[PDB]
Amino acid sequence: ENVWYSHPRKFGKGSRQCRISGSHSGLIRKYGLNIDRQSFREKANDIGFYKYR
Amino acid sequence: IEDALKVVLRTSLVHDGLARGLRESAKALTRGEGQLAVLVESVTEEAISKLVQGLATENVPLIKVADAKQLGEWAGLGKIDRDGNARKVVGASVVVVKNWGADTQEREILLEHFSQQ
Amino acid sequence: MLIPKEDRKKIYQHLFQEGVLVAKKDFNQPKHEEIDTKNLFVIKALQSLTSKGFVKTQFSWQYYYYTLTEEGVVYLREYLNLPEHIFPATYLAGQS
Amino acid sequence: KKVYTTPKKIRHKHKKVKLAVLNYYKVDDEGKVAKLRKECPNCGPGIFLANHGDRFYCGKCHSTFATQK
Amino acid sequence: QEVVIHKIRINLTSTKVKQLENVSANIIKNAETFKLVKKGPVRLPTKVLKISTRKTPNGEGSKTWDTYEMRIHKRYIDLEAPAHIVKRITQITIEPGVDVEVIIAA
Ligand SMILES: [Zn+2]
Known about the structure:
This is part of a larger assembly, with chains A (53 residues), B (117 residues), C (96 residues), D (69 residues) and E (106 residues). Chain B has 117 residues and is mostly helical. Chain B has helices at 6-15, 23-30, 47-57, 68-75, 107-114; strands at residues 36-39, 62-63, 94-97. Chain B has a three-stranded mixed sheet with strand order 2-1-3, with helices on both faces. The longest helix of chain B is centred in the middle third of the chain and has 11 residues, at 47-57. Chain C has one domain: Arc Repressor Mutant, subunit A, CATH 1.10.10. Chain C is built from three helices and no strands. Chain C has helices at residues 5-18, 39-50, 70-79. Chain C is globular. The N and C termini of chain C lie far apart (40 Å). In chain C, 17% of the residues are buried. Chain E is α+β, with helices and mostly antiparallel strands and 106 residues long. Chain E has a single domain (1-106), classed as CATH 3.30.70.600. Chain E has two helices and six strands, in the order E-H-E-E-E-E-H-E. Chain E has helices spanning 17-34, 84-89, and strands at 8-13, 37-42, 47-54, 65-72, 76-80, 99-102. Chain E has a four-stranded antiparallel sheet with strand order 2-5-1-6, covered by helices on one side. A two-stranded antiparallel ribbon of chain E has the order 3-4. The two termini of chain E are 16 Å apart. Chains in contact: A-C, A-E, B-C, B-D. The B-D interface holds B 22-23, 26-27, 29-31, 47-48, 50-51, 54-55, 57-58 and D 21-22, 25, 27, 30, 32-33, 44-47. The site of zinc ion has 7 residues of chain D, from loops. Chain B: Belongs to the eukaryotic ribosomal protein eS12 family.
């Protein structure tokens, strides 16, 4: 409820936020994925990226 | 006896309109909001009761009578869980009904008996 | 958590109407979708509801996945009084 | 982990302040009910104001209302 | 009863090539059966979506990189054809994977 609990979280690490764990380190924003690297590694074959070259 | 009591309390609970206590009751009274007020005839001081009556007079109608604890039980205050009561004890003090819900029964009959003889 | 009662009631009603609740782990934020309340409160309410059976919970991709059992539904109805034969979507209506 | 931090100063939170109250809405001996102190017209007559010292202040719309007399 | 020529572009999008090929074949067959003016399935530069990522989740170790890539196939078709019937045609036959998009203009 507090109108003093949050300052601007506009960019960098604020709005630039994870879409799996809730982390902030290693954020591939390419094609608007917003996934962490490690998670992506174990999921990319389902999202559709592979090891062709 | 008294169909527009328990049922009315239930309706109030459904639609949020049991201004239970003093301050809440007063608030309900101040404008055309509180339709029916239930007080206790047998309480300490009685000055408070008189004040309540005055406020009502300033909608007016009041159902008097005693039996505070029973009224409290009817209205539902505390923890239910089972089917009935399951508390220590709770009185009525002053309860002002702001809602009505469904008609029929003795809704207007009790009122007629009281306000309009 | 202590939620303003009316808001809580509204939330409950919405849940009943749906049979499904979301609200992500996006705390602090102004307002949830569909229901016009602060999210934290909603989440807490949901958790409370779950605590005794009632609802289901999954934390997947920070989403929260809230759906009620029939007993839970009944309890919800009791909480908000509401007459017989008012349906979420567990009771089938369409054709597929 | 490094342990213990004491810069002192501790407090509870706030008192409810119980009382018996309702000296407001004052009564004349069977005839008329009288409104003590002050009450807010902007929020609705009946909603009582608070008097402090050259200030009359609402509770429901707190920071919104201030009156001087 | 309408009979009005649209002159319409239809774009396909697919991560899978075989499915796309099948869809193209289907479209060609449809064109043949109804006898319609077309520009034969035109290929595009296939966008390869490269995400370069260190395979190590901690960083401690040798410098190993993996470029996780997704080759995306477009392929479009141009149909100079009538109205309602054409619309009906350009909706049916769906393979899992390939997305069919029909635009507008009359
Ligand atoms: Zn005010």
